[PDB]
Design a protein around this ligand. Structure first.
Ligand code: EHS
Ligand code: FE
Length: 287
């Protein structure tokens, strides 16, 4: 699972859950397909090292990278463009793991996946491994610390008697997510209790309907609207505008929280600034 590195000493020998690579120190031509780790490059002052980004899925908080060469999207990866750039490192997360062999023929390929069962330790390991490549451990540790302090401030205000349900909307369908899922940080790190701790985890979640939401009667509903990312016309607010949901504590107290999908769905959890924004977004919704 974790990334491990030995100094060798114009490069590191690096092992991660997908394989092994010789990575040069201070790489100067990096193609990044994980949006969180791209934000981390910004935070570490490594902008000039980046030579390709998935411009098709570039969110509002990463527009300083809008003039970098495009390598397509996080799903629609453009291999010819990657190859034409002649990168010295490619950095990927779980969306691209199915392209690993093809990517690794072009250049050493680092996997920075987030472990849903161990979010914080994977986050730390991803960030510190990237910073090791550049001799920036001290800086990265200080910014990791600030994240921990933000986490403690958020936890401080959580009402231990209330419960939340996490849902994803897509076209007209609703699915639910719980602890240890792709959104589990809400329960697992920030301390917010779940209406159902036993939701089977899966990439796009457990299928449910409004009767189920009413039955659980959450105090907070956290909504990730995938429609926004795919450019469908439907919106979670429409799907949830019905009599079953309306009866819930969440609806009555206006605690149906539409989380920014450019952070939560595109999944920029590896970012030293973007993870802080997510933590703030939760905190401010429940304080
Ligand atoms: O519509 C998309 N993908 C297809 C096909 O998706 C996949 O290849 C698989 C599911 O078949 N998805 C992933 O592997 C995946 C992995 C991590 C996080 C994800 O959101 C994922 O979708 C689908 O859901 O049918 C899509 C477009 C942009 C961003 C996404 O996250 C998407 O899921
Ligand atoms: Fe997806």
């Amino acid at each position: 699972l974790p990334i491990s590195m030995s100094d060798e000493g114009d490069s590191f020998l690096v092992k991660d859950s997908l394989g092994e690579n010789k990575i040069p120190k201070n790489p100067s031509k990096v193609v990044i397909l994980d949006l969180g780790i791209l934000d981390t490059f910004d935070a570490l002052k490594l902008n000039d090292k980046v030579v390709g980004v998935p411009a098709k899925n570039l969110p509002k908080y990463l527009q300083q990278f809008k003039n970098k060469p495009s390598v397509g999207g996080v799903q629609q990866v453009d291999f010819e463009a990657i190859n034409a750039l002649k990168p010295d490192l490619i950095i990927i997360s779980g969306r691209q793991s199915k392209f690993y062999d093809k990517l690794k023929e072009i250049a050493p390929t680092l996997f920075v996946g987030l472990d849903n069962a161990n979010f914080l330790s994977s986050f730390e390991n991803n960030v510190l491994s990237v910073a090791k490549l550049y001799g920036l451990e001290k800086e990265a540790l200080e910014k990791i610390s600030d994240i921990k302090n933000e986490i403690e401030k958020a936890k401080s205000i959580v009402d231990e008697d209330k419960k939340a349900l996490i849902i994803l909307t897509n076209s007209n369908k609703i699915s639910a997510f719980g602890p240890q899922s792709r959104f589990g940080i809400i329960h697992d790190v920030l301390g917010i209790n779940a209406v159902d701790e036993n939701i089977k985890v899966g990439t796009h979640g457990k299928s449910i309907n409004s009767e189920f939401i009413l039955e659980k009667n959450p105090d907070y509903i956290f909504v990730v609207d995938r429609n926004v990312i795919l450019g469908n016309k439907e919106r979670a607010q429409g799907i949830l505008d019905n009599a079953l949901v309306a009866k819930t504590k969440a609806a009555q107290n206006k605690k149906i929280i539409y989380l920014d999908p450019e952070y939560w769905y595109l999944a920029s959890g590896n970012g030293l600034e973007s993870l802080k924004t997510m933590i703030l977004e939760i905190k401010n919704a429940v304080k």
